[PDB]
Amino acid sequence: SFKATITESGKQNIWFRAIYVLSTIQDDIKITVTTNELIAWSMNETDTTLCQVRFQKSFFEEYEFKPYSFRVNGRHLTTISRKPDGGIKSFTIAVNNRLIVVIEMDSLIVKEYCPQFQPIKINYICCNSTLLKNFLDNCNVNVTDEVKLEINVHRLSITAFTKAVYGKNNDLLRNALSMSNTISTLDLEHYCLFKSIIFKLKDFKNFITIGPSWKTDNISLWFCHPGDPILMQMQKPGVKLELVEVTDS
Amino acid sequence: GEQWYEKFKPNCLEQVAIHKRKLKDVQEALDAMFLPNAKHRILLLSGPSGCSKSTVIKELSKILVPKYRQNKVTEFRGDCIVNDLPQMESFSEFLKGARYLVMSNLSLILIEDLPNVFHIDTRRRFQQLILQWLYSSEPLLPPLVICITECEIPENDNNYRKFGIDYTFSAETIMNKEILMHPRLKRIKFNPINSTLLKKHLKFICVQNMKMLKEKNKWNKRQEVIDYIAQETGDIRSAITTLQFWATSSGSLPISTRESTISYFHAIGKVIHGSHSTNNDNEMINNLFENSNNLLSKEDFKLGILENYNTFNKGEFSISDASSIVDCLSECDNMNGLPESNEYGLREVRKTFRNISKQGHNHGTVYFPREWKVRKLQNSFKVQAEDWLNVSLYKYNAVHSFRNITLEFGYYAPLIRKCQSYKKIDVVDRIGGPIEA
Amino acid sequence: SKENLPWVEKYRPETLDEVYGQNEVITTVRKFVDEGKLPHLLFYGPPGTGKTSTIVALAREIYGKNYSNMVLELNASDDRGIDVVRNQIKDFASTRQIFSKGFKLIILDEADAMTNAAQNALRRVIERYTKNTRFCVLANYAHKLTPALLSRCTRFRFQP
Amino acid sequence: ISGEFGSAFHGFIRRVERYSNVNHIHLMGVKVELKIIVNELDWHLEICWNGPLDSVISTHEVIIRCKDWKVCSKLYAAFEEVVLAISHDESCVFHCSLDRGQIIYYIARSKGL
Amino acid sequence: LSLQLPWVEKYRPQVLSDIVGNKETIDRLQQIAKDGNMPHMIISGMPGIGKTTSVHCLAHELLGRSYADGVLELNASDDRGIDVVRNQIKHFAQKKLHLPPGKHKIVILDEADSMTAGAQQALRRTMELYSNSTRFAFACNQSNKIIEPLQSRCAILRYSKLSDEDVLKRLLQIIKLEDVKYTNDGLEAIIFTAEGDMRQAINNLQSTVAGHGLVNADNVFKIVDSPHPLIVKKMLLASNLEDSIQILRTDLWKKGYSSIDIVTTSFRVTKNLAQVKESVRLEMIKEIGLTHMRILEGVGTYLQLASMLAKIHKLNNKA
Amino acid sequence: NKFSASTVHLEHITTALSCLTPFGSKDDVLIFIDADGLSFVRENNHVIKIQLLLSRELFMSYSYRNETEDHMKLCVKINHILDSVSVMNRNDIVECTLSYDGHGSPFVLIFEDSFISERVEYSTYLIGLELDRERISFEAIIKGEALHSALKDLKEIGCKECYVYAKTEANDENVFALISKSQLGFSKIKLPSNRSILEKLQVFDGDSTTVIDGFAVIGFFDFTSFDKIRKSTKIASKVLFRMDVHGVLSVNILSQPGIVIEVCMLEKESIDEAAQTEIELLMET
DNA sequence: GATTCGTATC
Ligand SMILES: Nc1ncnc2c1ncn2[C@@H]1O[C@H](COP(=O)(O)OP(=O)(O)OP(O)(O)=S)[C@@H](O)[C@H]1O
Ligand SMILES: Nc1ncnc2c1ncn2[C@@H]1O[C@H](COP(=O)(O)OP(=O)(O)OP(O)(O)=S)[C@@H](O)[C@H]1O
Ligand SMILES: Nc1ncnc2c1ncn2[C@@H]1O[C@H](COP(=O)(O)OP(=O)(O)OP(O)(O)=S)[C@@H](O)[C@H]1O
Ligand SMILES: [Mg+2]
Ligand SMILES: [Mg+2]
Ligand SMILES: [Mg+2]
Secondary structure, eight states, X not given: OEEEEEOOHHHHHHHHHHHHHHHHHOSEEEEEEOSSEEEEEEEOTTOSEEEXXXXXXXXXXXXXXXXXXXXXXXXXXXXXXXXXXXXEEEEEEEEOOBOEEEEEETTOOEEXXXXXXXXXXXXXXXXXXXXXXXXXHHSOTTTOOEEEEEEOSSEEEEEEEOOOEXXXXXXXXXXXXXXXXXXXXXXXXXXXXXXXXXXXXXXXXXXXXXXXGSOOOEEXXXXXXXXXXXXXXXXXXXXXXXXXXEOOO | OOOHHHXXXXXXXXXSOOOHHHHXXXXXXXXXXXXXXXXXXXXXXXXXXXXXXXXXXXXXXXHSHHHHOOOOEEEOOTTOOOTTOOGGGHHHXXXXXXXXXXXXXXXXXXXXXXXXXXXXXXXXXXHHHHHHHHTOOSSOOOOEEEEEEOBOOOOOSSXXXXXXXXXXXXHHHHSOHHHHSOTTEEEEEXXXXXXXXXXXXXXXXXXXXXXHHHHTTGGGTHHHHHHHHHHHOOOHHHHHHHHHHHHHOOSOOOOOOOOOOXXXXXXXXHHHHOBTTBOOHHHHHHHHHHHOXXXXXXXXXXXXXXXXXXXXXXXXXXXXXXXXXXXXXXXXXXXXXXXXXXXHHHHHHHHHHHHHOOSSOXXXXXXXXXXXXXXXXXXHHHHHHHHHHXXXXXXXXXXXXXXXXXXXXXXXXXXXXXXXXXXXXXXOSOTTOOOOO | OGGGSOSTTTSOOSSGGGOOSOHHHHHHHHHHHXXXXXXXXXXXXXXXXXXXXXHHHHHHHHSSSTHHHHEEEEOTTSOOSHHHIIIIIHHHTTBOOSSSOOOEEEEETTGGGSOHHHHHHHHHHHHHSTTTEXXXXXXXXXXXXXXXXXXXXEEEEOOO | OOSHHHHHHHHHHHGGGGOSSOOEEEEEEEOOEEEEEEOOSSEEEXXXXXXXXXXXXXXXXXXXXXXXXXXXXXXXXXXXXXXEEEETTTEEEEEEEEOOEEEEEEEEOSBOO | XXXXXXXXXXXXXXXXXXXXSOHHHHHHHHHHHHHOOOOOEEEEESTTSSHHHHHXXXXXXXXXXXXXXXXXXXXXXXXXXXXXXXXXIHHHXXXXXXXXXXXXXXXXXXXXXGOOHHHHHHHHHHHHHSTTTEEEEEEESOGGGXXXXXXXXXXXXXXXOOOHHHHHHHHHHHHHHHTOOBOHHHHHHHHHHHSSOHHHHHHHHHHHHHHHSSBOHHHHHHHSOOOHHHHHHHHHSOSSHHHHHHHHIIIIITTTOOHHHHHHHHHHHHHSOOSSOHHHHHHHHHHHHHHHHHHHTTOOSHHHHHHHHHHHHHHHTTO | OOEEEEESOHHHHHHHHHHTTTSOSSSEEEEEEETTEEEEEEEETTTEEEEEEEEGGGSSEEOXXXXXXXXXXXXXXXXXXXXXXXXXXXXXXXXXXEEEOSTTSOEEEEEEOSSBEEEEEEOOBOOOOOOOTTOOXXXXXXXXXXXXXXXXXXXXXXXXXXXXXXXXXXXXXXXXEEEEESSSOEEEEEEOOSTTXXXXXXXXXXXXXXXXXXXXXXXXXXXXXXXXGHHHHHHOSEEEEEEOTXXXXXXXXXXXXXXXXXXXXXXXXXXXXXXXXXXXXXXXX
């Protein structure tokens, strides 16, 4: 039926990073196969986020399909596609209720795995992903549970703050640690106001980290309203990235 | 093909085996937390297993949430072992993502399966996070519904630390004093389904399975077995499972249902006043020990017997019987938790109350022992005595033993300081407060 | 240097012919050895009646030379919690036998000192790996042994 | 403290400080060598000093606490001329001079050998 | 040193037709085997009455060639923590396996009475989420140790103690298949000392055959010992004190029984002991408790047991 | 002194004693002493035995001034050594001297930094798994790095239990694979037939004399025991496998006289042989 | 299990 093989190292790095991110979003990495492209999507139980990774036909050297959605455990798949220390030369993934994946190192040692699978059914911002990755990864998910993205008509400022909560007598049950940064409009590649948006940080960190895994660099953000979900996207030669997260009301 | 309790799930709240008052008191509350600027932030439902809590929540969220949706239920999954995240952060992530369900999104939250609360760290994290939800400074939040199944944890490997979740899985032993006593918290304790609702619903299941029931000629007997099942259990799911097992069978298999645990005051009343349908004290006490040894093997049970043995005929019985009861309790206190001690004490109490029980008795109401009050008073006394001793060294060099503080210095020294106060030192009032009667 | 020992652990029997008193137990275990079938034994009796002596002599007679790698002996002096039973005992009674063949022996001296969790874990080890391993449970007090553990053992009583 | 042996002897003196179960050190001198002996059930540690050592002028062993040895090391750090005197099973006298400003530290035995 | 499986595991039944005892329960299990709609079930009873064998036979007769990857037998010897429950059970239940039309996967949980409570809650979630594909079979000694939320989903089957006739029939089957010489009184003695336990009966029969050959009363009673609870009951119900003392001495003290064992057995016997008044029974329980305390503190001589018997006779003889 | 041995390459003793670390971290280690050298033998659960040997040519000085007994046997606690020899090297000769003065004497380890001599004395305590060389089911010679990668992957996966495949072929298509049974289930880790990695693989039919083709050898090993060899394979150059009929796996590791490691493993009883058919069918597929 | 009060039904 479906069969795909990647011979390029950076493509395998992107595949591994994407798989790890979808595993960190939900324990099950939902995967469906289309002759045009292979798309991997995941839905957190809270239903407040949605990330999809698209692998086009040109991504794989031979993306043959002879027909399909099947649910695969995320942790099992993320430990298969990992790069061992000290060089995978061919990653063949195929299905003909067991998924078959064949891995061979440069030293010709060959491994096969048989994971189980389950068949199932405004404004525009374009900023450098490097500076965004800098600020984001510098933040810690432990202290920060809330992101404040605000754009001024002159500068763009992003901060990793925390929603404070007070108890019986102004009790500091949760603090407001706010790691902040300010960025001028020269760094921002394309801004179109045609604004305050509040959402999470961990998923944003993982999605941002997905991109630069290819050593071959911008992220486009369109949004509106507080009760409506924000769109999030990045584009690669054979890889297409999407994230949809519900913004704070 | 499918389980009877799964294919016969009620399609509407008219089909649910719940009391009329219970349905009204849950509907009014659920509407109360639904309106914007709601007073009740969260709702807590507690009760035994299979008392139709989740079912009524399903139907109420089915015909209530759509009314307030601007232009369903969301459950927590403890099995979600997500990558890169520690287990203790799963509920944190769930709550952080579930609070984004206010505007253009509305879904009542049902925490049906709690996180693992037997681990003290994540239990404390659960308490802190649900308190942060309760004390939240957010302008508004989606309604929170939490269902707790009250079940007794049976005995296991001898290592018990929490002392609350390790003897009983209830809302009191999970949630702390602050959480339950909160203006924005609503608690509706549930009761086992009565025999009338069970009989009616079992009849409905039978009249929907007449062909098979008529096929095996068991329809001429279904009424007696339905009455027996309704009397045996107050569990709708267990009753339907037992009925399905009886119907699908083709023999004379006895109808056996899960045994429900006996509460604290239930056990106290069974020890004091006996048990109906069991005129044998020996067999009743034996079954009480086999089934509820976790509850009976405690000092709190002997304290409860001592505190509540005077509720028999409003203390209107012979003093010889009371002396015998307290004598046996004191003797049992000298056996250090041996099973023979509890057995002998309960047997003697039951025998004493049986030899004096007749008709025309008007008993009182039992109460929980006041020992914890005495422990808190003793702790306050210890704090006050420590303060007095601390003041009694730097002000004037003198070391006094604690026994003397309890005996003489807790009364005479405050008296002297009060006389000194009138003809004029920090500690002027009596230690432990005044005594009365 | 057997002249440098107390008389108690100087006249400890080395062979089954030197264990006096328990004629019936010794005869039955000798028959079990001769027939080649050894069940899961349980030796119970007062202290100093010949339980450890009997079991060690029997194991020496069954495995004359392989005794070091054919018998796993545990006692109260060794920790025998849930983890020990789960790991050490299972891994010993889960692997193939040394030299040509045989059945492995696991002697539990003073098993009344084991917790109920350890015995509850041990019962399925006893029932599952009985094809190539046999257990011996030595105990002075039988009320400290789980009824299932007593059920899956052949009882031999050592009289005074 | 300053010279070829300055860092070496300082390290030898402070090598006792890298264990958390060392409260009573046991100095020892044989007529020369300076041996710091630690007594524990784990392993009998026997730190010695192989470098040539002189005398200001038979065993001489004195058990003292470890804080006294810390004070001794601090004294040795800032003193060029240092004299270490030992009283068999009695006390340890740490004489430090600055050619004069003299420092003497009197240390009493903690345990009898 | 050789190769010969013990009769307990060599003769463990492989089909439900070879299991004796609770005829109605075994017939119901055979019906479940034929139709195939197995519900969640809890199996409880005394040890050695055919609970594990019933579960495994039902699994085999229900899954056939798919038994290899169709059952997940977890036992007390295996780790069964919350994490193990979650990971292993969830992955087994999520495994989509095509089975015959009326068939499900089976998750045998032997010794479920020794499982941590949080693991039981995780089992609750798994039971109520994957019930359409897999079913759970709990094997336990007492159903109290399974939490009420789990008993709510299960069809409780209670295995009663094996009657002497069923154990005699199984013994006769094993005898006529192993060719042992016997006497009727010998099999009666084996039945009597087994006390409703099939495993104990098989073990005692094999021990008698190995030790002496012919299975008569003399050989059985010279190799096996009469149940000491019966001796304790005989000594507690004795009319005069001299007879009770003599029974205690010659049947429990000379036989090499621990004093703590005698006291504990006396308490257990007194709990289930008819034909005695409630006051007399609780007085005997009190005296047994006092003697148990004296034994626990180290004074475990024969004098303490004789004194306990004397006090019991004082209370029950109006002396 | 009955035995004395000085060396300047303490890295050998460090790596050597780390090679016993995958075993019990808190237990006793048995040390033989003989003119050929001293060996650190360790055993776990009567089911696995490591044996690491330091030959006499390893030490610049090796005396063994004793003749009453051929070998000296002493048993010491492993973590006493591990705690004591935590010297952080120095840079100073750091020369290490091993001493033993017969029965009743401690095992001495002297460390000299040309001024400081931190002498440590270890208390000695009160005092098998060999494959029968005439019968070898299969013998394989693999390169160390490939085997290390295989165990690293198998540990990445968890691998509750492991299997060994050995089936030589008429056309010399020798196949050697490590089959696991984990959360994923059956994962086949097959090593290549190239002479770069696999330099020799002969599968016998008993007596280790007849090279028989077309038949496979299956070894059911507990992976907790199979992991004990992982750290030894890290320094190894060529790793030699030798499995007999009695279910004993012997690993012959030599980091080329260097150090020589002898890991012997007992193999699981394989209660059900249906898994054996499953494994061989997975292989031929 | 007991008491008190309130329902609902027959
Ligand atoms: N007439 C009925 N009314 C209500 N529930 C019914 C009825 N018939 C069958 N059921 C089923 O009975 C079950 C009762 O579940 P609930 O009591 O709502 O959940 P629960 O109270 O959490 O039970 P536990 O404590 O988790 S075991 C549901 O699965 C219903 O589908
Ligand atoms: N039947 C016997 N024949 C000869 N010597 C015996 C016999 N029984 C005990 N002994 C002696 O008693 C010593 C210790 O008895 P053991 O049998 O080793 O201990 P035990 O029987 O296991 O009692 P416990 O339960 O361990 S306190 C032996 O070394 C023998 O000298
Ligand atoms: N009814 C029976 N018919 C035939 N053999 C039986 C029967 N009951 C028990 N046995 C024998 O007992 C052994 C297995 O008994 P089990 O069913 O495993 O005991 P159990 O009922 O599981 O008790 P526990 O709680 O596991 S100790 C085998 O040797 C069987 O032959
Ligand atoms: Mg429910
Ligand atoms: Mg002994
Ligand atoms: Mg069983």
